[PDB]
Amino acid sequence: MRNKIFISHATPDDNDFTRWLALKLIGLGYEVWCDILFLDKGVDFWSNIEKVIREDTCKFLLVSSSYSNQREGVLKELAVAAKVKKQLKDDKFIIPLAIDEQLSYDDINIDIVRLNAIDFKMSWARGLKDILEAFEKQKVPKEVADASKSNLLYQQIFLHDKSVIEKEEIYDSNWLSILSFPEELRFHEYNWMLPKRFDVRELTFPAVRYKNYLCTFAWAYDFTYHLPKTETYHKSKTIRIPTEEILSGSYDSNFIRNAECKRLIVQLLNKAFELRMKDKEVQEYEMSNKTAYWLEKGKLEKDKFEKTMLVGKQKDKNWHFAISGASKLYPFPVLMISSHIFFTADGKKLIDSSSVQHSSRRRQGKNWWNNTWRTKLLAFIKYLSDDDTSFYLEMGSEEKVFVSNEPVKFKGNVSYNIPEK
Amino acid sequence: MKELIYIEEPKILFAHGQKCTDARDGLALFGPLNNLYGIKSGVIGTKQGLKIFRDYLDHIQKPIYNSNSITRPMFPGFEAVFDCKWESTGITFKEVTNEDIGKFLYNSSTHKRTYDLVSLFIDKIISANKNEDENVDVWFVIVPDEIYKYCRPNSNYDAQFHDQFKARLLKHTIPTQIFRESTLAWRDFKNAFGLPIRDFSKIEGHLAWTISTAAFYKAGGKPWKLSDVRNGVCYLGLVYKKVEKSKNPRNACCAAQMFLDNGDGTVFKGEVGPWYNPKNGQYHLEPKEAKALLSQSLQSYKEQIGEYPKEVFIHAKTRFNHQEWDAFLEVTPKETNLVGVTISKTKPLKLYKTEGDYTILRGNAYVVNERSAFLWTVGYVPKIQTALSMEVPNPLFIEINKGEADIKQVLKDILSLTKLNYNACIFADGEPVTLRFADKIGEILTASTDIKTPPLAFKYYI
């Protein structure tokens, strides 16, 4: 018995309305046939089209758009439709559905001009109501409406190739793990023998002020040259605290709180990173709250490290990849590197216009994707390496912290498929 | 290496009891949750503005496709998707002569001219609402471009047109939508080069989708509410704003945005006081204001539902100190569980895929510990085959600052809270809705410092 309602159209341009009406009608209680409903293909498609048109189809709507007016498939289906129309003696077997305004009345195919066209050009809902009225008048058998079948069909035909798959992936971050730390942190006895109002930050080996004492990663007698006034220090008044136990966080004494000690270590690491990259002949740019370091044009050959394009040109400007440093603990000891893009004109002198710099940063970064950022960050990390495995960061005369040059890897269990287009 | 867990995308409920993961497809396929008879429209502006609004209203009825039909699905038409009659006939029009606009457009003092233009709109709005026996749904204020160009800061009340306009009607409860002439008629408006100022030829369908969703919501209907729900759970978001005009630098104002299942939130206004510390730059409340705000929150919840909530979440951008939290805990009934979470975007951890130019999939999370974790809410998605943001995403830092709650449930809850934004029918947003509108609400409520209003629905603010 004939219950299937055929839709003919040109593909893939007319897929939108075809999908809409088919889904609404198949959720309304009817049964609809069209090319894009199955996604199986291969079973002698023309013979199947003949079989459904001649044997199973009840009504036939042709999308009388500009493209579908004379396409070979549409014309062939229309010829078979005329044959079966003469067979079943149904004058209203063919229903045109004009879906555009640019098709002139003279242009429409001769075989469909005579038949009454149900309007779909002004509004789709009124056209759907007209079609529903036509189907009530022509008394097509049907059951109750059910949109869950529409949901299932949309999920299984059109939400098929864009799902979540269980695939392993390896992601690279921008964090450097600290391998080893000095054995002990030393607090000295000063501020009665250094001059008052002293800026210890300008000293070579970094140090910080803690009320009476002086907190630094250095022995007692390494500051003689900077402060000749302090040569009288006796090496028996330096309190030493293991660093590994601070990392464990189990220290607790009236002298220092654990959080304050960790903050002092963070400041020391920040300063040490600052001077260590000062030694590596990279230019500095003082941002609003941090300092970012970049490479001058021509510092490295072809402005490239290995196979990464670090310094480039955009229009009448030169853009540089720059990095800024910071430290943190208690995920585990970590150093962060933050990426930035800066601009110049002559290759050495920065542009003093902040708004122009921001606009150029936006314009250049709009065309940078994940692979570019990852490769540039990896190349800049590798440029600072002293060994093949890690690079040292100075703590004192005989104290260093060795930071690995490979960021921490992350393992993911869910992935997708790269789109064809 | 470190392992990443996966959090599945939540589903939102739609018409006929069906659930979808994208709101646009569900709307175009099933329809909105609650349907109205039709939209009774009111427009105030010049005659040309009325003509432009009428033309656009007739235009959005026709189907309108987009260049990339897989990322930005097509718009069948307002009657087709929302099943409501938003027609260009039978609308109430109020006329503003160009001479009146020119009378106040040429004033030197920016604050003064902003005040006069706002009042010139507001008096007409209130007179039309009061004198007429007609019951208009929403008021569409179509404004010429020159006013917006000349009603912005640096061009005792704020110097922005949108914020002032939304603030002054807070006491009258009048839903208003502000449009420029250049947006509704982008094709007509051209530069000296002959090109349009605003090129919407590529995202016309998405623009119509957003406008239709906003108009349907502000008229009274609910487009969508999320499907997989925990019963009796409320969300609270705190907002602080330093008042610039105040002589004392420490004066600050607080507000609480309250959300339920439905995504139609309420706004509670707090008392202005010294909440800002200029030393370390963090905001904190005195005990009395905290008690008042929380008491109003659960009073509103009891009024809306009838029973005390089983759980309460207080999302904020900064950690809570002890006196604030014990003041908060003073008021809450003992049968309810309180959680206080902090969400901040300032943690610079970026994950890079080893192969392919695409970024990390959205939804992956790295749980640091049972109290703190990351969450990638703005990563890549396969549904539309394009990530939501450019460059490389920065994840949200979710740390349970106070109270005891499972971190995984909090992660799923915060991910679910990203699908409720009626102002834009988009796939998702990178910030939870409880904190997405912090700046807009704060500026709007600061624009008027004499605001003494009861709790109001969200549509009166946005």
**CA–CA separation, A208 and B192 (whole Å):** 61
Q: Which amino acid would we find at residue B372? A: S
Please state, in angstroms and as integers, the Cα–Cα distance from residue B398 to each residue in A280, B365, B367, B370, following that order.
37, 10, 9, 11
**Contact status of B450 with chain A (Cβ, < 8 Å):** no
Q: How far apart, in Å, are the Cα atoms of A12 and each of A35, A66, A181, A330?
A: 11, 13, 64, 55
Minimal Cβ distance to A124: which of B4, B77, B357: B77
CATH number of B35-219: 3.40.50
Contact B392 A124 (CB under 8 A): no
CA angle (A385 as vertex; A379, A386 as ends), nearest 5: 155
How many residues belong to chain A?
421
8 Å CB contact between B139 and B126: no
Contact A373 B391 (CB under 8 A): yes
Distance of CA B293 to the CA centre of its chain: 21
Distance, in Å, from the CA atom of A190 to the CA atom of A226, rounded to the nearest integer, reads: 14
Contact check, Cβ <8 Å, B361/A128: no
Six token digits for residue A180: 């080893």
Among B1, B356, B384, whose Cβ lies nearest the Cβ of A410?
Answer: B1
- Flag whether residue A155 sits within 8 Å of chain B, measured between CB atoms: no
Under an 8 A CB cutoff, do B349 and A125 touch?
Answer: no
Q: Is residue B415 within 8 Å of B363, Cβ to Cβ?
A: yes
- In angstroms, this model's resolution equals 3.7
What one-letter code names the amino acid at B270? G
Nearest to B256 by CA among B210, B294, B216, B303: B294
The pairing of strands B311-316 and B41-45 is unpaired
CATH superfamily of A4-158: Toll/interleukin-1 receptor homology (TIR) domain (3.40.50.10140)
Cα–Cα distance measured from residue B96 to residue B119, given in angstroms and rounded to the nearest whole number: 12
Domains B35-219 and B229-460 share a fold: no
Q: Which amino acid, A95?
A: I
Nearest CB to B1 within list A125, A409, A413: A409
Q: Where are the domains of chain B?
A: 35-219, 229-460
DSSP letters, A46-71, are HHHHHHIIIIIEEEEEE---SGGGS-
Residue appearing with tokens 């100075």: A394
Q: Decide if A102 touches B, using CB distance below 8 A.
A: no
> Quick check: helix, strand or coil at residue B187?
coil
What gap in Å lies between CA B461 and CA B218, rounded to an integer?
Answer: 11
B281 contacts chain A (CB < 8 A): no
If DSSP codes are grouped into helix, strand and coil, which group holds residue B326? helix
Q: Which of residues 327-386 of B touch A (CB under 8 A)?
A: 348-361, 364, 366, 368, 380, 382-385
CATH match for B229-460 among 3.60.10.10, 3.40.50.1980, 3.30.420.10, 3.40.250.10: 3.30.420.10
Q: CB within 8 A of A112, min separation 6: which ones?
A: A62, A64, A78, A94, A96
Query: Where are the extended beta strands (E) located within A270-351?
Result: 283-286, 291-294, 304-305, 308-309, 311-314, 317-328, 334-344
